[model samples]
Target: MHKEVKARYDEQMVLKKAALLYHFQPEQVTFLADAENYVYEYTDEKGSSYILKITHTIRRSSTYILGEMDWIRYLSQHGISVAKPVLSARGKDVEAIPDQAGGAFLLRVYEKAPGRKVTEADWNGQLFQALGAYTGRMHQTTKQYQVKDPRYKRQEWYEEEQLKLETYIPSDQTVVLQRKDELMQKLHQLRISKDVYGLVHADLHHGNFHYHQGEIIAFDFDDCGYHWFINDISILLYNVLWYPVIPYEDKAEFTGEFMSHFLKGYRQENELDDAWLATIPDFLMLRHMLIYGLLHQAFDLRTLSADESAMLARFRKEIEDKTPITPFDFHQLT
Candidate 1:
């Protein structure tokens, strides 16, 4: 969620409008989170649960939002497990309501992904296998996809505001910007073969999906966009290996434990290029840049909690010091 939008948000108004537009009682919608977008869980008259995600037009255009729904629906059609979009009362996945400020609110809902989110204790080889296979299938499917509408095409890797880091990074932070540009230059120089580069979940991690009946059902395509397939692998590694409780020295062991099962599952569906596997470190560094900017965009820097403060400090240090996010070599996954 952008700080500007958070400042102007009207919870009651949004709840009322959501209920009216979606035909669910206001009480049926309960606030879930405000991470990037406003999230709510709603129970229909049939007692089935669904997830509602809302974003301001300022944050994401209506067409860009529709692009995500299209991508999810496309994957679901290809037999990949995803929380596909459902139609609103107006018979569209996207429902728009104008705000007094002139920009509109874009709202959409999805069949709540089945099963349960797991903790670190709940993770194991079997679960990792499921996640990897699901991701592998998604990447495989996306490679063949041709968008039905250009208006709904997902943003390209560099078309996003992320490259404009000056707005998010402090004015005097030349080193962070320098690192960002260096990473972009490297990415631009990479080979763009269809086999290695294409659309991806872009944020797959233990937290983004649920495990049910020995399968993974992923949701939140909010971050889906074009990127090297290995970028997805990089996001997974950093999120899993960098848990604050995990000591720095043990990162290598964790990577082996996680990737051994994960790549086994991934290879069951699709083959990753050896070259792509070797570049995971580059993508991991890029994730550090994006996560740092994300924190700045989403939080009030002066009021950051201790954990958030520490995270910012550490990410800044890594960006400034130019260190690998992990000691484990990503090529071993090959």
Candidate 2:
């Protein structure tokens, strides 16, 4: 789990106030998880359920949250199976309440999605295809999505990184800096166009969606940003490797199966350029570097789990030696 800044509000007090504001029972609200934000599972007096997401001002501004909600609503209106945000009693998308710490907490509620999260036993070709199709539909829609206000636009990929990581990475971590600069140079040469580039669900790992009856209902758009759509595919492949169910010895076989189904479903919704697919290795390296920097900044080395520590060491060596994780024949999958 990622480290997070502690919330200033008392848990029960916040739950009580939220129940009063959103017309739910305080007793029915249960803590879900706390990563970057405080999430709660709230059930109304009538037994209807919802999720209450609360975060600090430092994490996301009102406009950023609005942009995320706008995208989800648009996707939902277009028949995508996503959890749409619920407007407050006063009919506003956001509820900004001042905290005793002198900073404000941003609150947004979403209707509970119908399905449960998919597990290792549930991993299959049909589910992978559905996930691919859902993402494809999102990309197809996002290509033409126009923000009503420029102020509510999501950040571009380069804007969030490149410079930030350069400064954030320690001087001793030359491996990270070397890989980062290489990625920056490669991205600089790419041609930006609607066909290959646009807004994407930048953090679409197994944890971000639910699988019910062969369909995927995705949520968690906090990392949504502008970038090559292929980057999203690479990110998914990179994250799923850490799932305990995936035997490390059979990763290549699993990846081939996954890619075959995922691309089959993805292509049904949108077109992909083979030339761009060839650049996935670079993006994978980029993800590794980003995660490395984030882990270093968030937690101390002593607190890292055995798996995390091993991953950190592996990533550092990979970046230092300029090696790819596992090369595959994209031709077979394609």
Candidate 3:
């Protein structure tokens, strides 16, 4: 937990309110993950499963949550295999409950996406292609997506993450700081028209989605926002490069295989300008800086676990050395 943002809900208290709002029995709700938000496994009497997402109100405002749910709902309805958001008994997408601390928490429900997390055995051409296909469909859909209320608009890249990089990255890491400025300058100067830039699943890593029967059903739109469609591809590749299953020695080979198949399926529904492909390295570097900022903001350095400490140390070296995690290998797209 970040020092600034405190966990606001007790499990039993939240489950009680959830039962009243969603009309489920107390026994039916089981605790799930508790990262940035509190997620619960919701099983109805009929044995159907759902997910309950609860978050501190300060983490994401009502408008922000609306924007996210709006995108997920749109994707699910428009032939994308994403977990669908379920409305409350009152037909409201979100239920905001106030707490004694004077802040509040937001609760939302989602149908459990079918299938489990993809295993190492599942990391092959078929799965990578499906990941690309669904992502392509999402990008295609966003081009046509409209919002009725300006207040419910999704966040732009700079507004959400990019500008905040300066605060979290250590001032001593001059190389990282210099590259951050350079990347921001280059990114802002690029042509950003609606056709090429729009809402995107900014975090399309393997853990954020599920592969079911050869199709990818993506969920967790928590990080979805407006950015260059090209950035989506970069984020996907960046996440894949660091996956534990893909050894450091095997990054180049795996990246080649993955991106090759990924683009093949992606191009089925969406077009990728080779020009944009050239900018992937810049976006990957941006992702690295953003991660650095997030780590600093979210963890107390003295309390970091061994794994967390090691990860921070390794990435710090990467930043100081001005290294790219994996060089953008565009030859894969050939």
Candidate 4:
């Protein structure tokens, strides 16, 4: 566990709140070393498990926190296999914990998903196919929820990230700038096509999913937002870039198989235009540009260790060069 995480919360205090909120006593709360945020696990008096996601300063008011709960409810109503939120005594979806920083933080208690996280190596045709199917179903819903959400606002920043690469790249880095331009143009095409825009899981990486008993349980809707729907599929590849242990050699084969299965499942549930697949490559490139820019800037900060910065730098360079286009094949399954 990270030292900063331990410093943030008192176990005894957390247990007290858990007991009060859920109307049950907890045996213990274990801390998970989540890079994105701090979360705790608890086993209640009834022996049922729950996960309390703690949103810190950086993610305090993020739309993802609230948007996810609303979306989960919607997906569950539609019979999707998703982990539902366990509401507190007051019937609130989330508990607003007072933050020392001022405004406040959020701790959302969710029904413990029944499966384990799928690792990079374990991510194959079957998994991605399930993921694709899962995502397609989510997209097909196209149910523009009336709830106020902050995650939706971040989609604008996603576009701005690509623009930053174009405007901020050094004049000497012509090659990188060209790649950025190409991605930006593609993003513009998506905007105009009208085929790719709506609520999507902005970051559907393997780590975000749970698989058990031959069933897939999709969790972590923190990145759900309004944007080019196909961008969700594109963002998947960007996540793959960060975690290179996942083999890229067979990326095309898996993506093809996954998309086929995904589309099949999605169409069964909701009406999604089939043309959206054509725009996947463009958004895939856009997603890479955003990753390259964010990691390059994120690693440069002193807060990150030297080794972490070096890894990000290498990843950025690889994406900029586009040496391996294995994940972006156009005519694979066809």
TM-score of each: 0.91, 0.92, 0.92, 0.76
- Clashing pairs for predicted structure model 4, backbone only: 63-150, 63-151, 133-262
Q: lDDT (CA) for every model shown?
A: 0.82, 0.79, 0.81, 0.65
lDDT of 3 by residue, 96-171 (tens): 8887777778889999989988888887788888888888898998898988688788888888754576677667
lDDT of 1 by residue, 193-257 (tens): 77887888877776788878777888878878898888888888878775523344577777787
Q: Which 10 consecutive positions of candidate 3 have the poorest summed lDDT? A: 1-10
Backbone Cα, N, C clashes tallied per candidate: 1, 0, 0, 3
What lDDT is obtained when candidate 2 is compared to the true structure?
0.79
Model 4, span 1-334: residue lDDT tens: 2344456656567557766987765556676646665677778776888878766544446344666687788778876788789888899887776646564456688888897887665566566556666777777664554555545243443544344775533466667777777666655655432344676667677677678865678777776667766677667755654564465556666556556766565555455555666666666666666666656555545487878777666655755677553454555434
Residue 301 of model 3: what lDDT?
Answer: 76
Candidate 1 has a TM-score of 0.91
Indicate which candidate wins on lDDT: 1
Give me the overall lDDT of model 4: 0.65
What are the per-residue Cα lDDT tens digits for candidate 2 across 1-334?
Answer: 2223363666676777787789987678888898668898888878888989988776778888898899888888988888889998889788888776656778899988777888777777887788788878888888888888886799988887534576666688865786688788988798989988888889998788877777788888888889889888888878876563446567667777777888889988988887876777788778877877776766577688888888778878888887875566566654
